[PDB]
Amino acid sequence: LITSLSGEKDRWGKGAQDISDQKRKLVGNVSLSTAFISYCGPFNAEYR
C-alpha cells in the first residue's frame, strides 16, 4: 500500500504544510475576504 498512498501521503503532508507555513498569509487571506465582503457590496465590476 505504501506506493499506492503516494498521492495520499503527499496530500496529507503538503496540504497541512501549505495552509500552515502560509498560515499568516492565510490570516491575510481571511482579512482580504472579510474586507471585500463587509465593504465592497455596492460597487460595479471595474471597481469590485
Compute the residue count for the chain: 48
Question: How many angstroms separate the CA atoms of 29 and 19, rounded?
Answer: 11
Q: Locate 32 and state its grid cell.
A: 482580504
Declared resolution, Å:
38.0
Experimental technique, in short, is cryo-EM
Q: Locate 24 and state its grid cell.
A: 499568516
Side chain identity at residue 2, one-letter code: I
User: Scanning the structure block, which residue is given the C-alpha cell 465590476?
Assistant: 45
Question: How many angstroms separate the CA atoms of 24 and 30, rounded?
Answer: 10
Question: How many angstroms separate the CA atoms of 40 and 5, rounded?
Answer: 43
Question: How many angstroms separate the CA atoms of 25 and 42, rounded?
Answer: 27
Alpha carbon distances (Å) from 7 to 13, 18, 24, 43: 10, 15, 26, 42
